[PDB]
Ligand binder design. Structure first.
Ligand SMILES: [Mg+2]
Ligand SMILES: [Mg+2]
Lengths: 296, 296
């Protein structure tokens, strides 16, 4: 099975005057490359996929594919939908633009059954020849890919190599790797990056790595090299920023931190996303002061 | 304030050989009109909004608008999105195609803050001159429009005339109508249609009315006439069908029931939606035997 693992970054999408800042986008990806990141996730949830046009979806994948050309860094493009015909199209679309693999969110809002989730991902997997990573975030989608469904998809479809978990359920990550230890469990929650890695997870798709890519990649590589003491040290160290980056819904705090760190020009979102409250703005700025934020 | 209230139906969208069955669609709406329904809700969640193309979105709104010409029945079109610019576009689209009002579900998946929900709905309301009904379904969207946000939108925006609550929270239904008794609380959960109406709710947007429109229409009008004894009697009789119509995710059971009743020709969904399990198929078929299903 072809896999994409290690320290991965859910790229924010900087906007300037209602348009994608294409020069900040490429500049941020080369900052990710230069801080040990193994793969970048363009136009995911942290990249405000939902409010991007499908042309802008193309632009940020092409920028990500080009900026990581000639490097070891892979591009795991966000290509998910709650409509299977659309998800299949987004998967073929990401392949035809150079992405090394796709992250495919569980169908949101329409709450498909487990049988439907299987057929949903089966159609996606059969439409591409690139790796497919499932994304389970039940707090956002309103549905859950069960352990049995994840394992059945991993064994029955050849492109599906694992799942990114954002469920706050370390029990399920024991459930997953105890019954199917060959899959690539990916941490989708920065606060519990080390516990997921120490149980056999093989990477993270991180929000905090937008601001502190060196620390998240160091954390991941420590754990993969079985230096659990140094991996846990970084994880404990980042708990404060890992939690404050979710004081409001992602990616509102991380974009605030990127702006406060002077890494993006504008604290600009696309509605229904907006700037944080003045109190959370201050709290985010206060937690940052404890970290050394790498520049360009 | 211009309002759209009473017994309303969240229309299923019949499929025949992978296409929208346009002649069954109109015939089902005329069955709703003929059984006392006050408004129809095309291309909502029960209509599998997520898996329909924009042209099919256009086709089913136009069919609903045309079928209710010459009747008192209004058209409350589904026109919501987790992108405000898309929701504004869908709202203008529904108005320019004859819809009497729009149902706009809260942004699904990206979890906007309350401030973001306010600006999201303010932009939708200011783009049209037809009534706007909020839709709060947190189990599907991953976010909830709080009582304060619902009340502020009702008072600051003119087209916003109420909310369709599907949250299993009768406390919130007291909270809403006690602090702003002029808003139109609409029940989005069939099992608790009467309790919501008996506290001052002015209508329902029902799933069960697809199968039993006469019973749902009698319930609402009994309650609106303060005949709570006859309204509660119908609500109590409908509890069994109200619950079994959600044994799997809506609209999987209701489309199965419509098919079992011989009202649609094919039990066809669009992925990731699928047919129910053989056991739930039997349970739906068994509960239906206790009810009188009107024909054409
Ligand atoms: Mg009235
Ligand atoms: Mg009367």
């Amino acid at each position: 099975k072809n896999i994409i693992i290690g320290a991965m970054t859910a790229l924010i999408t900087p906007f300037k005057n209602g348009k994608v800042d294409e020069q900040s986008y490429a500049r941020l990806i080369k900052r990710q490359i230069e801080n040990g990141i193994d793969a970048v996730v363009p136009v995911g949830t942290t990249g405000e996929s939902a409010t991007l046009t499908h042309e802008e979806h193309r632009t940020c994948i092409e920028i990500a594919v080009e900026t990581c050309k000639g490097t070891k860094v892979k591009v795991l493009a966000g290509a998910g939908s709650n409509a299977t015909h659309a998800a299949v199209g987004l998967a073929k679309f990401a392949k035809e633009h150079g992405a090394d693999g796709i992250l495919s969110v569980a169908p949101y809002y329409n709450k498909p059954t487990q049988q439907g989730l299987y057929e949903h991902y089966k159609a996606i997997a059969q439409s591409v020849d690139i790796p497919v990573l499932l994304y389970n975030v039940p707090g956002r989608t309103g549905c859950e890919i069960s352990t049995d469904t994840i394992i059945k998809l991993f064994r029955d479809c050849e492109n599906i190599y694992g799942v990114k978990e954002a469920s706050g359920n370390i029990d399920k990550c024991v459930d997953l790797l105890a019954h199917e230890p060959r899959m690539m469990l990916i941490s989708g929650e920065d606060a519990i990056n080390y516990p997921i890695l120490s149980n056999g997870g093989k990477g993270v798709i991180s929000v905090t790595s937008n601001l502190l890519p060196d620390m998240i990649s160091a954390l991941t590589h420590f754990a993969l090299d079985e230096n659990y003491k140094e991996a846990k040290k970084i994880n404990d160290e980042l708990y404060n920023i890992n939690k404050i980056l979710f004081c409001e819904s992602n990616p509102i705090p991380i974009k605030t931190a990127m702006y406060l760190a002077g890494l993006i020009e504008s604290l600009e979102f696309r509605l229904p996303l907006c700037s944080p409250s003045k109190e959370n703005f201050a709290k985010i700025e206060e937690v940052m002061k404890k970290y050394k934020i790498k520049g360009f």
